[PDB]
Amino acid sequence: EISAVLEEKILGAAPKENLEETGRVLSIGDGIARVYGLKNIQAEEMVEFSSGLKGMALNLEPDNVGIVVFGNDKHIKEGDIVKRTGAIVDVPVGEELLGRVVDALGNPIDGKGPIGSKTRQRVGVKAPGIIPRVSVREPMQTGMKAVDSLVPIGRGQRELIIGDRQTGKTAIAIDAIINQKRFNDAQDEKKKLYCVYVAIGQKRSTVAQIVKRLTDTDAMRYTIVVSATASDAAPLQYLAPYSGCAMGEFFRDNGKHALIIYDDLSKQAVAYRQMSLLLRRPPGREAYPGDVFYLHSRLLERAAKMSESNGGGSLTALPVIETQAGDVSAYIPTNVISITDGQIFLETELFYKGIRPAINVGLSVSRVGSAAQTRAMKQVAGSMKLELAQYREVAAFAQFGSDLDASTQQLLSRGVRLTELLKQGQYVPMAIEDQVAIIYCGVRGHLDKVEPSKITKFEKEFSQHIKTSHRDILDTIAKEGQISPDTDAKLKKVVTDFLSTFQA
Amino acid sequence: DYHLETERAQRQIKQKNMVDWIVRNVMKSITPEQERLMLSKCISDLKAMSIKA
Amino acid sequence: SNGQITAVIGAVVDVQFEDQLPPILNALEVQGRSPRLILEVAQHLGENTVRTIAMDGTEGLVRGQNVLDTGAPIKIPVGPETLGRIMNVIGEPIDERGPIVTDKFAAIHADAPEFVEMSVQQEILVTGIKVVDLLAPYAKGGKIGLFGGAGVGKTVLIMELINNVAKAHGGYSVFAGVGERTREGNDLYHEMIESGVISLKDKTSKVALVYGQMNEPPGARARVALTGLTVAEYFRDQEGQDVLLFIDNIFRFTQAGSEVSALLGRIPSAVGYQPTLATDMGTMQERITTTKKGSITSVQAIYVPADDLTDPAPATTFAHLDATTVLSRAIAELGIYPAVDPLDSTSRILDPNIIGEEHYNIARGVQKILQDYKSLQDIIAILGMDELSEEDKLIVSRARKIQRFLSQPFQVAEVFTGHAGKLVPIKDTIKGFKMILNGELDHLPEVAFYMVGPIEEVVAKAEKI
Amino acid sequence: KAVDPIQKLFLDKIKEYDQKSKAAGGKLLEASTEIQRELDAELDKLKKMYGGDTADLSKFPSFHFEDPVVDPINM
Ligand SMILES: Nc1ncnc2c1ncn2[C@@H]1O[C@H](COP(=O)(O)OP(=O)(O)OP(=O)(O)O)[C@@H](O)[C@H]1O
Ligand SMILES: Nc1ncnc2c1ncn2[C@@H]1O[C@H](COP(=O)(O)OP(=O)(O)OP(=O)(O)O)[C@@H](O)[C@H]1O
Ligand SMILES: [Mg+2]
Ligand SMILES: [Mg+2]
C-alpha cells in the first residue's frame, strides 16, 4: 500500500531534463535579488532559485533583473542559478483547494498531500469592466442579526470590517463562513457559496485554531485557507490576497459564488511598505508608498457580481482593517473606505460593555443597502432602523431624565430591547427565518413586557416553540416571502399565548 | 477514530523510517562502473538535446 | 521609426530607438501584444532612449520587444459618435457596442485656451440644493469642486447634480470616471439608459462616458481625465455647445501622477508627491474653461486623503475652482446630509451685484450665526448651555435650526434613506432662511427643520408632532 | 524508452526495504533511538487520549449501563 504509493510517486516524478534560460545572482539583500542574465524574461514572470525558492521579476533593467523573493533571503547567495518558469506569476485554482490550507504560492501546508489541480490562474488579472458586471441583488447571509438587518451584504459586494484590535473582526468573518453550511448542504446550487479565508500577517497558531473551528463545524468542506503568517516574508504577505482572490475568481468566472476575507489588509499594507522602503521608493503619508491605494484597489475591484452572459457568478470581499484607538481618519483605512461598498465599524467602547458583536449602528454603512436582502428582512429591518435612530436621538435625555414623557420612555424602552436583540453569541450564526422572527417580535412591541435581561432566553424558547408547534406560520411566510397582516394577527396571538404560558 | 489515528501514526513513522533507510542505502551504494554508465547516458542525453532543435 | 524595449519597471518603460526619437507625449504601440498596449513618451534619457508611461499593464513585456512609433500623441474619437458610448483612456469603446465609427479624432494633449479666449460673464446656476444655492452658488459656466473625504458623500452629491442639472440641460454632457469604482460606472451607465440620457436605439443620446477606474494602471488613471477633457473640448470648440463635464474624481489624476513619478527618477516633493504637482494640475485644469466659442460647466469631485485639506493635492486644486463645496465628516456624523461645510464653501459669485442684495444678506446672515455658534461651542462642550440667558441660547437655538434646515433629502439617495427627494427653488430657499433668521420660527422644534426641503414642510412637520 | 538508472536504483532500494521489513515482521529497519522515542510518544499519547488504560480499545467496549431514573408520582 504505502510502498505502492511511494513507487508511483517516484515513477510519476520524472525529471524531464532540458536546457533552461538561466541567470546569475549578483547581489541579494533586503528581499530583493539582482540577477544577471535572463534576456528573454517577461515582466512579473515567476522564477525559480537554485534553493527552490520562487521569485517575481519586478524590475527589468538593461544590466540586471530585480527579483522579489517569495521567501527568506538567507537561502539565496550571490552566484546562484535562477531559472525561468516561463510563466507570469500564477497559483493553482479549482475545487481541489477546498478543505486545504495553502501558503501564498498555493503550496499545501496542512500536510494532507499534494493538490490535484489541473488549472492555474494569474494573480495579477485585471478586474472586470463596466459591461460584464451587473447590480448586486443576491443576499449574502452572514448569520449575524446586526449585520444581515442593518448592514446587509450582497453577493458581489465589498464590505469592510473595520475596528480596533480584539473587537471581533475575525469573529464576524468566521461566522459568515460557518453560516454557509446550511446553503452548501442544500441542493439549491444558486445559494451555494464557497469561501476563501486569507490570513495576512497573523499568528500561525491563530490560523491553526481557525482551521480547527472550521473543521469541527464542518465548514472546511467549502473553504480555502491561504496563510501568510507573521513569520512569513513580506512578499508572501503581499502576494497572499492576490493568490486567494485568484482562487475565488475561479468560482466567480465559472458560474459559482465565492466569499473572500482578507484578514487583514492593514498588515498587507505594512508588508508592502516594507518592500517599498527596501526598494528605496519615496515614502509618503505614514511612510507608505504612493501606490498603496492601488495596492488595495486593484485587489478589491476583482470582487464583482457578473452578468448572466458571463455565467452569473460573483465574488464577495470582506476586507479587514485594524485601526489605532478608533481612528478611521487615518491614511490606510480611509483608502479602503473609498474602495469598498460600505464598512462595518466595531467599537472598543461597546466591546468593553459586553455588547458583542460591537457593531456601531450609526457608523456602519452598506452602499448596496436593501437591494440585496429578502422581502421579510427588508420590511422588518426598515422599521428597526427607524426605531434605533429614534432611540439614538433621545438617548441624550436618559442621562438626567428622572421625569420623562411617556412617548420618550417608550422610545427608550423599545431601543433597549432592540439593542439587546442584536446581541449574539460567537460561533452561533442564525438562519434568516430565525433572524426575521426575532427582529419582528422586538420591533412590534412584543418585548415591551419582557425584561431586557431575559431576551436571549426568550429568543431560544420562543423560536423553539415556533419550530415545533407553529410550523404552519413559517410555511406561510416562506411561501409568501413576507409577513401578511393575517400572519401578523396569528403571531400576535401566539406571542400572547407564549408569554402567558411562561408566566401568569 | 482511535484505529485511524493509530494507523496514521504507524504510517508516518514507517514513512520516515523508509525515507532515511533509502537515503542511507542510496548514498552508500556508489559504484564506478555504474557512474561511468550514467556519465555516458548524460552525454548522450546532452547530445540528443542538441539534435532536438 | 522602430524601437526596442530597454527596461520595464512598473508602469514606466524605457524604449531605445535607432534612427529618430519620437517627441515627448507621442504615442507608442507595442507589437507583440494581443490587446493594444500604448506607451506615452515622457522624457528623453539620452543615448537615443526615451522613457515612456504605459496606458495598460506591463506584464509579459520582454526587453528587446519591438515598439512602433505612431508619430502622434494619443488620439481619441470625438464628436456626436461618442454620445451614448463608453470609451477608455485610448478611445477604445468598452461598451461592447462595436467600434466608434467617426472621421474626427483629437489628441488628448492640447494647449489651454489663451487669455484672449476668455469669458468674464458669470450667471448663477440654480441646483435645487439649499446649502449650495444659498451659501456657495454655482456659476452657469465655471469650475465647481466637491472636496470631501471617503464616505462623506461626493458620488451621491455629483449624482444629484446629474439628476437635477444634466436632465434638463440644452446641450451635451461628459462624465469622466477617474479612478473610482467600476460598480459606480455600471450603476451610472444603467441610470443613463433608464433615464433616457443614453439611447441605445437611436442617436438621441446626450452624454459621453469616459472611464478609467481604480483597477487601471497608474498610466491610464493619470491620462483618462485628459480623454474626458478632449471629448468636452470638441463639443465646446468645434460645435459651440454648452457642455457639462462631471469628473469623479480628479484627485486620482494627481495620485496616479505621484505613482508614476516614483519610477521616473524624480526627487520627491512634499508629502511624497511629484515635483510637477502644480504644473501638471494647472495644465489639465486650464483646459477646462468657458471660452468665447462655447461654455463648459465642470463639476469635479475631489478626494482629500486622511480628511486633510492641507494636503498638497487638494490645496492646489482650490485655486482652480470658481465655486468650492467642502464636505465634512463631522457634519455627516451628525446626520446632516448633504454634509457641506457652511464656513468652508465659497462660490466667487457670492456678490450683491450678481445674486442680489437679499440673497447675499441672508447667506452672510446664516454664516454669521453659524460662526458665532462655532465660537460658543467650546463653552457648550465643557460647561453647558448656561450662558448669557436669552442672548446666546437664542444664537444656539437659531444656529441649530439653520444646521437642520441646511440638510435636504436627495432624489438619488431616496433608495437607502426612505425620505422622498426634494428639489427646492432658490426663492423658497432664501425665504426659508430669512424666516429662521428673523426669529419667526423660534417656537418650532428643531427636529421639524431636519431633512425637509421647503420651509412649508418644516411647519407641516412641526404641526404633525 | 530507457528508464533513469537512479529511478531503477530507487525502486531496488524500495524492494530491498520491503523484503527486509517483511523478513522482520513489519518492524523498523535500523531505526535510531529518536525514532523509537517518537513511536513510543505517539502510542502513549493515543493511549492517554482515547483512554486505553481502562479498557481494551482493540476489542468491543464493555458497556456498563444502568436503569433510567423515573421521577416519583407527586412533586
Ligand atoms: N459575539 C461574541 N460573543 C462572544 N465572544 C466574542 C464575540 N465576538 C468576539 N468574541 C471574542 O472576543 C475576542 C476578540 O475577538 P476576535 O479575536 O474575533 O477579534 P479581532 O478583531 O480578530 O482581534 P485580532 O486583533 O486578534 O485580530 C475573542 O476571544 C472572541 O472569542
Ligand atoms: N445626500 C446623502 N443623503 C444620505 N446619505 C448620504 C448622502 N451622501 C452620502 N451619504 C451616505 O454616505 C455614503 C457615501 O456615499 P458616496 O459614495 O457619495 O461617498 P464618497 O465621498 O464618494 O466616498 P468614496 O470615497 O467611497 O467614493 C452613502 O452610501 C450614504 O450612506
Ligand atoms: Mg482578528
Ligand atoms: Mg465617491
Tab-separated table of C-alpha atoms and ligand atoms in Angstrom, chain A residues 338 367, chain C residues 154-156 180-181 184 248-249, ligand 4:
chain	number	residue	atom	x	y	z
A	338	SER	CA	-13.012	54.845	-0.616
A	367	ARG	CA	-23.848	51.246	-0.021
C	154	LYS	CA	-19.309	63.095	-3.207
C	155	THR	CA	-20.583	60.476	-5.642
C	156	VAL	CA	-24.081	60.961	-4.201
C	180	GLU	CA	-13.374	55.289	-8.985
C	181	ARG	CA	-15.489	52.172	-8.540
C	184	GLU	CA	-20.394	53.033	-9.787
C	248	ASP	CA	-15.228	61.710	-10.421
C	249	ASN	CA	-12.736	62.137	-9.129
E	4	MG	MG	-17.113	58.568	-4.475
